[PDB]
Design a protein around this ligand. Structure first.
Ligand SMILES: Nc1ncnc2c1ncn2[C@@H]1O[C@H](COP(=O)(O)O)[C@@H](O)[C@H]1O
Ligand SMILES: Nc1ncnc2c1ncn2[C@@H]1O[C@H](COP(=O)(O)O)[C@@H](O)[C@H]1O
Ligand SMILES: [Zn+2]
Ligand SMILES: [Zn+2]
Lengths: 295, 26, 297, 74
């Protein structure tokens, strides 16, 4: 795989595919990318930072299980009595399976950064004119083990989320699709923006995808990393219509169920794209890119 | 075309259940 | 009502779960400034690694975490079955039942402490050089201890400097970090004391391990009175592990003996909460020495 | 003081493991050389020898400081 050679400078093995320790070099560029993204934040945008876990009930309510049940990481633990826990530990001591004593917590690992923002927004009553905009980030988890450096199980996601009327959200997404491309250009990256779909689970799911593609609810900024034939989505631009507005009872300024949309930046994918494109020697990166990043 | 009629997803789902699956033959 | 509770309005938003909060821009700005301050004290030659919020379950098991805090560990589980089995689980959910009966453990856990993954990484490099190795590590950590108090979270940030070497390398490291950490706390205008302490080992036999630990003075904590001076909050710890990790991971020091390790740990969220409790939520009203030290201007 | 002589024996038996030293009633157990697993094994030895079970509330540094403070607990 074309990205494999980057591993030695960027990552250390943590004994699990898609889960890596990040070197100082790698983290310095993720940090500069995050700072660059922040510098493009629209005025009036509320910034929230989420932990890597969120309420299981909130995620269930958002409908994640109808779409990607196969990707979800649930938090489980030994919730029993002292005696039961001791047996589990004793089983482990004997080289057995202590994990049979696990039961689900009321938490999951967040599969995307925006999910927790919807109930937060909803708790504030009806939307002002022009809607609400949020800047959110979380370390996310998707259960998709792979050896490829652009397909991680644990990865950073940064998002700008818009909640409002259809026009508010559509205008928002159009601004960000142009703006994202300008950022990618400034970063010296090769890319194209194309129609896309989420990888919905099951037979029905793949037909949900076709319909999604047909309605142009999702665009991706695609960067050739292993090949030009199979480029990597490093950003997405998502229109959810009224799904979350209805789910969480968010009402726009006109009394109608809010529309929502988000622009998502895959921070690790962007960092890997930078190193693939420009190499691991920062002093040799192009002057304009070094400048854009404040190096 | 086929999606401009007003057929959204939940509407396209029933069309799957009425009658490999690529964004071309539909 | 807890004395910290009034801080929630400015610092956090509810995420529907005790100990799990969204962080406001105000709160995060201070966590970031504290992180940068800690970085400014990093010793030369210290290798910086950043870990994700999950780590290998096998590695954590091998590190002995289950024999110590089985109750705090968060495991990752998933739906690992057939497409039919997974569809059925979702249908049970649709029909008022519990989809989670189809979960099975993954090979990952949520990391309970930032330093765990670094020992196998160190081990893979062969014998330690003279003077040992130093690491700067950080991770979002998880401990299953739900609570409504703003100083006891389930998901929280930990930053550590870690020393791996001879007993003497490690004791020297801890001694210097105990002094420096106090200087930092003092520079931040915090009221604190440093005291011998123990980890909350599980079960009756665990209580004894705690006794030995206190007796051997293997753990110090920097304690800050937040709700009261009777139950202060441990915001940093200074831990000597003796040869536990060296033996476990086969790390040999420069003299061919099983390496000792230790770490100084900063609780980033506790430090941030300590700062807001101590100085209030209006940053312009913070003492000038503190604003200066943090680069607030 | 059958207890004292027996306590010193089990302590001396655990210390009889790649080590050797002196043992007095006012001497602190940690100073003697006992580590965590030793203290665990010593607690099990005491519980097995005198046919009793130490309450969790009694497992404290005070009671397990020295042989003196230990015998005073039993
Ligand atoms: N497994 C993954 N590894 C790394 N980055 C990912 C992964 N999945 C998603 N991302 C990034 O997160 C962004 C948002 O994800 P999505 O919600 O799937 O559109 C994507 O455009 C990618 O840049
Ligand atoms: N539940 C918690 N919530 C917030 N911070 C914590 C929590 N547990 C530990 N920490 C922080 O992490 C540091 C290291 O943890 P420990 O390994 O328990 O000494 C502590 O000194 C605290 O500052
Ligand atoms: Zn989103
Ligand atoms: Zn540590």
């Amino acid at each position: 795989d074309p990205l494999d050679h980057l591993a030695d400078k960027l990552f250390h093995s943590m004994g699990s595919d898609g889960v890596y320790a990040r070197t100082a070099l790698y983290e310095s560029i993720v940090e500069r990318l995050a700072a660059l993204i922040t510098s493009h934040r629209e005025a009036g945008t509320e910034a929230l930072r989420f932990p890597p876990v969120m309420s299981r009930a909130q995620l269930e309510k958002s409908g994640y299980l109808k779409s990607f049940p196969n990707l979800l990481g649930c938090v489980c633990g030994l919730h029993g009595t002292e005696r039961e826990i001791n047996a589990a530990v004793s089983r482990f001591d004997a080289g057995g399976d202590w994990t049979t004593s696990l039961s689900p917590a009321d938490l999951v690992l967040s599969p995307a950064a925006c999910y927790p923002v919807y109930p937060i927004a909803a708790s504030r009553g009806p939307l002002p004119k022009g809607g609400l905009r949020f800047d959110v980030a979380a370390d996310c988890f998707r259960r998709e083990p792979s050896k490829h450096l652009d397909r991680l199980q644990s990865f950073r996601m940064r998002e700008y989320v818009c909640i409002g009327t259809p026009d508010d959200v559509s205008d928002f997404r159009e601004r960000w699709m142009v703006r994202a491309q300008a950022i990618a250009r400034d970063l010296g990256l090769t890319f194209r923006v194309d129609y896309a779909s989420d990888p919905f689970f099951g037979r029905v799911g793949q037909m949900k995808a076709v319909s999604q593609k047909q309605q142009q609810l999702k665009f991706e900024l695609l960067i050739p990393l292993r090949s030009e034939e199979q480029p990597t989505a490093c950003m997405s631009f998502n229109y959810h219509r009224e799904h979350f507005g209805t789910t969480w009872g968010i009402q726009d300024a006109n009394g109608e169920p809010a529309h929502t949309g988000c622009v998502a930046f895959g921070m690790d994918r962007l960092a890997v794209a930078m190193f693939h494109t420009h190499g691991t020697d920062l002093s040799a990166w192009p002057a304009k890119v070094r400048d854009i990043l404040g190096l | 075309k086929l999606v401009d009629v007003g057929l959204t997803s939940m509407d396209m789902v029933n069309l799957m259940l009425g009658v490999e699956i690529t964004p071309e033959n539909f």
